Design a protein around this ligand. Structure first.
Ligand SMILES: CC[n+]1c(-c2ccccc2)c2cc(N)ccc2c2ccc(N)cc21
Ligand SMILES: CC[n+]1c(-c2ccccc2)c2cc(N)ccc2c2ccc(N)cc21
Lengths: 150, 150, 47, 399, 150, 50, 50
């Protein structure tokens, strides 16, 4: 829900004032979006051990985790190893018993996605769609009818 | 939600629509104008590439048999077959760099037996060099394989 | 050391002039092969 | 000549290849929707299906997600070309395929579509190219930083010389609908500011409430609103909060509607506000000159505005490397032509077969349309080795 | 590099058993060297400034960059970074019948950043023309605006 | 606790950078033992209590 | 080497300072190692010569 300015100081800047005391570091970049998404990249030296740089970073952000909104806490914070690019892209469709752009995306992320991401050292998976959820669309006219709020 | 004065019950359905749908409607994919989801897997900053993607099909192979009707897998954007070409074209080139050998060795020395020693000399060296790259750290890269030809 | 000095790499082009050594391992074996073996075969069997 | 055919021979890093797989991105103007960009991704799929059946095996479009970042302003199709056997000509290979693709998407479109080749490599090492970044070091804000980078893009594009191509990464700059909740008006009629904030936040943006279980697996539960009650500015007042005194109160009572200019992608470098700048060295010039003739433009800008190079290069390959390498590679070579020889003549014989073979290695690369990249920069050293050999045979046997 | 993790991911199983006051404060696990080396003093000459104006500028421009530079263990700022300081008068509190509990409540309400959604997102009605992010409560900037809290 | 020792309430933004907000008291109302009784808490019944 | 890059960050900071803000260097270990090379390589040289 958050806009670009909201994420920029309530999450982005909070973690950046807590991103120090980390062996080897060339620079740090950052993004903050109107969609409500932030993504930092701490780039290390050539041939730096990435199995340990993915800990000094991920146990340091965390001293600033309690200084964030509770909304971000119950959402997915993550510290993974990146490779700005894909390799295998496994599309998934239906032919005979036809199904939708939502029925397929849930089955992908409720049977195959969790097993894929833990398999032979995968960095990070990007699900093309969304896992199912108990979605509720509140009508504000039928809310005022019985004197009620969200 | 409520029980109004006159015994009537306000339910959650009576104020809001309720459907089982995605937790994020921001992105939706089309495979050739056909409704589709998928897995854009990304590398792990040190991983073994084509071995990792070999075990992407390891998980995926045990998934196929328990699919609903119509659910079939499809393979766009894939890096695997490019390395299959770079071995099948290099080991081919290699072989043509012999053969073309043999010819020059017969052209200059009509003695057969002589055209034979050079055709054992070099296969043995190719092999021993594989053993030293394994011992020092490196792999059968696109680079190192071109250095078997130079 | 037309090879290994050039294979003293610097930066993102680390494995690039590195993976020489692949070359040098090949050279020193063609020396070995030709210091052992070729000497042998030449005598062993020829004319 | 060996000099002349070398200085002129331009420098690349590593050639861009046909990988049986390329892709092509989409991007729409300020404040476009999911319907608009899906119309563009549709038209793009036709060039690859209707007008490219012989070369394209499949397509995998994705709406609302570019490799710039994210949002319903973008898109991306992943091409998977038919194998190399069924693609014979140069016509039917990625250079030519993405060339008339780009021409078609600049002609019969009205947004911003490209199509790019697939390096392999990583993003970096474009060569004759750079990645600048302008930093705010003092206590200015996003509004004074936007003005400063605009001035640097203007000086770059008003004396180039020998010219350039320079543009921002993606601060497109679009409006935002601010709501001003008056606090004395709220408490007066008896509404909690807590109640009001989870009414506007849960309704328009959604809210992660709790977990449930569908078919064994635990997933999320979200609460939001039917689409039609949250599309335009006038739908704000349709939501009624409850006040302490058991009576409804519309949003229009305390709220106030007005527009305002912000940025949908605020970027930061080394814990400071910043904006990425993606330029490229001239068709004449190349990198070492372009970067240093962008440095004097950055220092000519207002106070509290410095710079730093994200992110291109650290030290390159024609640059301080190649020299040093060959340089050392000589100081040896001359040795071991001494460890088996003794003189001061033997080695100087071998130490000018070096340019003998080299000239032809240039010639060929300089003649056919290749370049001084990595692959040529290693056949270069395989030659001194094969020349030394052939020569040294001359020397050893004669001495 | 690893002893600074086994320790710092173990303290953390006892982080929820601490007061919330300590959680929002800075807990830390760093590498020590009981001693300093470089001590960079910072003063003013011409446009004179104080033992507080200087300590803030040091910790809002140079300190964050210093601590992440070439593997620094821990930095000790000689002074303090600026903060919105409020000195409550208890005589002027009794005058309007009030406590410091009410002062705190008005800061966690008016000085806040709220996440309003967006017009035209996220699953829209097929045919919407625009899509912009909503701004709501913005965090406070100056000493004047904190004085105007109701 | 908030008066004599201070209390970290919330975050704000000064000149772009996000810093802290503290709440405490003027120095003179928290120096000696006799300044304890000058602080008046509010009771349920809307009347002050030293 | 660490303290060499303490001046790396610090050098890019100086130019954007307010009026009067000047850096000063008390308590510093750097120049002690500059003496231990310039007095050892000197000693070395005197151990030749002699
Ligand atoms: C920079 C890491 N690093 C070191 C290294 C350098 C300094 C201290 C310890 C190890 C290295 C040291 C020797 N002898 C031989 C090969 C490599 C190497 C090879 C490949 C790579 N990708 C990183 C490499
Ligand atoms: C022509 C420069 N150039 C490239 C580019 C083209 C080829 C190679 C490298 C970069 C570009 C590439 C992508 N993907 C997306 C946007 C732009 C862009 C946008 C604006 C501009 N004013 C110049 C731009």
């Amino acid at each position: 829900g958050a806009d670009a300015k909201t994420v920029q100081d309530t999450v982005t800047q909070v973690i950046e004032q807590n991103m120090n005391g980390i062996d080897n570091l060339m620079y740090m970049s950052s993004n903050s979006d109107s969609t409500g998404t932030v993504q930092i990249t701490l780039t290390f030296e050539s041939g730096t051990d990435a199995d340990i740089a993915q800990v000094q970073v991920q146990a340091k952000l965390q001293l600033a985790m309690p200084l964030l909104p509770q909304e971000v806490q119950q959402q997915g914070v993550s510290v993974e190893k990146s490779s700005s690019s894909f390799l295998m892209v496994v599309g998934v469709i239906n032919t005979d018993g036809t199904m939708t752009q939502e029925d397929i995306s849930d089955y992908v992320a409720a049977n195959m996605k969790d097993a894929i991401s833990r398999t032979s050292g995968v960095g990070d998976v990007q699900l093309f769609g969304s896992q199912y959820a108990m979605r509720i669309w509140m009508n504000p006219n039928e809310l005022n009818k019985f004197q009620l709020t969200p | 939600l409520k029980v109004n004065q006159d015994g009537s019950r306000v339910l959650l359905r009576d104020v809001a629509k309720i459907e089982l749908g995605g937790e994020n409607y921001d992105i939706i994919a089309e495979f050739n104008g056909q409704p589709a989801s998928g897995l854009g897997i990304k590398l792990a900053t040190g991983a073994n590439a084509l071995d990792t993607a070999a075990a992407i099909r390891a998980e995926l192979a045990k998934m196929e048999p328990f699919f609903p009707s119509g659910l079939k897998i499809v393979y766009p954007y894939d890096t695997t077959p490019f390395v299959k070409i770079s071995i099948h074209e290099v080991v081919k080139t290699l072989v043509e760099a012999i053969i073309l050998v043999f010819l020059v060795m017969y052209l200059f020395l009509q003695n057969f037996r002589a055209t034979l020693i050079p055709t054992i000399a070099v296969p043995v060296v190719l092999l021993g060099t594989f053993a030293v790259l394994a011992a020092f750290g490196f792999s059968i890269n696109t680079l190192t394989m071109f250095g078997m030809v130079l | 050391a037309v090879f290994v000095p050039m294979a003293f790499f610097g930066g993102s082009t680390g494995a690039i002039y590195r993976q020489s050594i692949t070359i040098v391992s090949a050279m020193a074996l063609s020396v070995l092969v030709a210091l052992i073996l070729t000497p042998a075969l030449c005598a062993t069997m020829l004319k | 000549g060996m000099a002349y055919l070398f200085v002129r021979l331009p420098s690349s890093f590593l050639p861009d290849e046909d990988q049986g797989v390329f892709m092509t991105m989409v991007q729409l103007p300020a404040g476009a929707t999911q319907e608009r960009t899906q119309k563009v991704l549709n038209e793009v799929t036709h060039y690859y299906l209707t007008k490219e059946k012989n070369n394209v095996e499949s397509v995998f479009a994705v709406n609302g997600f570019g490799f710039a970042g994210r949002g319903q302003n973008t898109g991306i199709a992943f091409v998977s070309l038919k194998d190399w056997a069924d693609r014979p000509g140069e016509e039917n290979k990625v250079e030519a395929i993405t060339m008339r693709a780009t021409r078609a998407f600049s002609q019969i479109k009205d947004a911003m579509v490209f199509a790019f080749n697939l390096p392999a490599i990583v993003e970096l090492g474009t060569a004759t190219g750079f990645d600048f970044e302008l930093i705010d070091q003092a206590g200015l804000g996003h509004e004074k930083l936007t003005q400063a980078r605009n001035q640097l893009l203007a000086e770059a594009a008003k004396h180039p010389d020998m010219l350039t191509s320079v543009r921002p990464n993606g601060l497109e700059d679009t409006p935002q609908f601010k709501i001003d909740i008056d606090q004395e008006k709220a408490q007066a009629l008896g509404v909690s500011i807590n109640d009001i904030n989870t009414t506007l936040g849960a309704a328009w943006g959604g809210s992660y409430v709790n977990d449930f279980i569908d078919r064994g697996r635990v997933k999320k539960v979200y609460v939001m609103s039917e689409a039609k009650y949250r599309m335009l500015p006038d739908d704000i007042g349709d939501w009624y909060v409850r006040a302490a005194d058991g009576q409804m109160v519309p949003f229009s009572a305390f709220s106030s509607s007005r527009w305002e200019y912000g940025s949908p992608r605020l970027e930061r470098y080394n814990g400071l506000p910043s904006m990425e700048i993606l330029g490229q060295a001239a068709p004449g010039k190349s990198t070492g000159e372009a970067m240093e003739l962008m440095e004097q433009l950055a220092s000519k800008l207002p106070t509290g505005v410095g710079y730093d190079w994200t992110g291109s290069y650290q030290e390159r390959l024609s640059g301080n490397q190649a020299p040093s390498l060959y340089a050392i590679s000589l100081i040896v070579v001359f040795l071991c032509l001494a460890a088996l020889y003794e003189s001061w003549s033997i080695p100087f014989s071998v130490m000018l077969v070096v340019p003998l073979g080299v000239i032809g290695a240039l010639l060929a690369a300089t003649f056919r349309g290749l370049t001084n990249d990595v692959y040529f920069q290693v056949g270069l050293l395989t030659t001194i080795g094969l020349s030394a050999k052939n020569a040294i045979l001359i020397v050893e046997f004669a001495k | 590099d690893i002893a600074q993790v086994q320790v710092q991911a173990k303290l953390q199983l006892a982080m929820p058993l601490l007061p919330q006051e300590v959680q929002q404060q800075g807990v830390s696990v760093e590498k020590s060297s009981s001693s300093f080396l470089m001590v960079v003093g910072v003063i003013n000459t011409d446009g004179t400034m104080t033992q507080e104006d200087i300590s803030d500028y040091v910790a809002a421009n140079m300190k964050d960059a210093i601590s992440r530079t070439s593997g620094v263990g821990d930095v000790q700022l000689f002074g303090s970074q600026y903060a919105m300081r409020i000195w409550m008068n208890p005589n002027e509190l009794n005058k309007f019948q009030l406590t410091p509990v009410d002062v705190i409540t008005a800061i966690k309400a008016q000085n806040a950043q709220v996440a309003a959604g967006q017009l035209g997102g996220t699953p829209p009605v097929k045919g919407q023309q625009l899509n912009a992010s909503i701004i709501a409560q913005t965090r406070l900037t100056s000493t004047e605006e904190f004085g105007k809290i109701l």
